């Protein structure tokens, strides 16, 4: 298996069942429900066993951004292999387990696949009278919803659907966690940009935590810099990138999971979503080294 | 000068502006901090409705 190449959903799909049967007693599939176009929503759970609190790691919520499912799909092969060598990560998965949606808008990924490859959303059907489709899986959470940086026009890439969790894709991932119930740390990949983020993109106030969220982030983004020189900037979504009702960390932290946070991967416009190839695994490597830095955080402080 | 956020249907974009406020054609626009992309980008200063405004966009990421 190339972890250097863009592949289709169905080779993506192959490799986690490959993961699978090559480390049955570490590595599981979990389905937590189906696309609008009925595809299956399939999460990787890494174990040791017991009953414990998780991490969440999600990519792909958005079509376009084809270098976050290629590392999410990396990082699962590097957790198996790493297992029982790297103190670390041992002693993480001794405390918690891990959760890993590669990809968690498949319908979307295929229309990019195949017919747009700057295709944004979901792929479901607009309600109205409209004549454009799907809506935005990161502004269709229950945080804010409705509020400045998302659009009630369909035809926008910022639509955020008729109510909140009205996407099958997010109502899946929501009704998983709150039935799980110990997760502790949510994290979701987007690309670009180059930025390491925490709440609130519905308002652009200091949360609670944010001195502690502020240390990690720029922990994490320290040592994701050491390997090859990428600059991270930091800082609450609202003032480094925009204001973006309806998000998933702000639901996740409003919920009571604290370590919340989101990466921008990347580049910074040079190629923009297009990223090479070349730069997959490089970009795979060194965004290993901050979500390292933010796990061994959450394995250090329980609550 | 003041600094503003627009948000249009398949992009966001910035505006820093002296004597002037971006046009109801640029889409839904407030007055908001500006973010690390928007100084990197928004370099020159153009004549801008009554005034001059330096201005960049990016897309939903
Ligand atoms: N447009 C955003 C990027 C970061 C965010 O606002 O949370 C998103 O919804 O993908
Ligand atoms: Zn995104």
């Known amino acids: 298996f190339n972890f250097g190449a863009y592949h289709t959903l169905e080779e993506i799909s192959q490799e986690m069942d490959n ?35 998780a991490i969440w790691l999600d990519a792909g919520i958005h079509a376009r951004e084809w270098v976050t499912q290629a590392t999410a799909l990396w990082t699962a092969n590097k957790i198996v292999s790493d297992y029982g060598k790297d103190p670390s990560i041992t002693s993480i998965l001794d405390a918690l387990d891990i959760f890993l949606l590669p990809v968690t808008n498949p319908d979307g990924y295929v229309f990019s696949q195949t017919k747009n490859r700057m295709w944004r959303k979901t792929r479901s059907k607009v309600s109205a009278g409209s004549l454009c489709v799907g809506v935005d899986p990161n502004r269709n959470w229950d945080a804010g919803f409705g509020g400045p940086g998302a659009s009630s026009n369909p035809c926008s890439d910022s639509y955020h659907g008729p109510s909140a969790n009205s996407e099958v894709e997010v109502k899946s ?14 994290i979701i990949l987007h690309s670009y940009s180059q930025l390491l983020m925490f709440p609130y993109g519905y308002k652009c106030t200091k949360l609670d935590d944010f001195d502690e969220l502020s240390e990690v982030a720029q922990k994490a983004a320290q040592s994701l ?31 009571g999971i604290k370590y919340s946070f989101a990466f921008e991967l990347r ?26 830095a933010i796990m061994e955080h959450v394995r250090d402080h329980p609550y | 000068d003041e600094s503003f956020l627009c948000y249009q249907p398949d992009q966001v974009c910035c505006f820093i502006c002296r004597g002037a406020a971006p046009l109801p ?24 409705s009554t005034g001059q405004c330096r201005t960049t966009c990016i897309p939903y990421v």
């Open chain 1, 173 to 186: 991932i929501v009704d998983f966690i709150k039935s799980h119930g110990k997760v502790k740390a949510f």
């Open chain 1, 225 to 255: 810099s050491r390997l090859h020189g990428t600059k991270y900037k930091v800082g609450p979504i609202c003032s480094v990138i925009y204001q973006a009702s309806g998000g998933s960390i702000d639901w996740s932290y409003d919920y």
């Open chain 1, 19 to 53: 993961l699978v049967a090559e480390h049955p007693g570490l590595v599981s599939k979990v389905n937590i429900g189906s696309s609008f176009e009925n595809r299956p929503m399939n999460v990787l759970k890494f174990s040791t066993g017991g009953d414990k609190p």
């Open chain 1, 267 to 292: 580049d910074t416009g040079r190629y923009g979503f297009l990223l090479p190839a070349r730069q997959i695994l490089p970009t795979a490597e060194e965004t290993w080294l901050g979500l390292k």
């Open chain 2, 25 to 48: 054609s640029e889409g839904e626009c407030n007055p908001h901090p500006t973010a690390p992309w928007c100084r990197e980008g928004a370099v020159e200063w153009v004549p801008y």
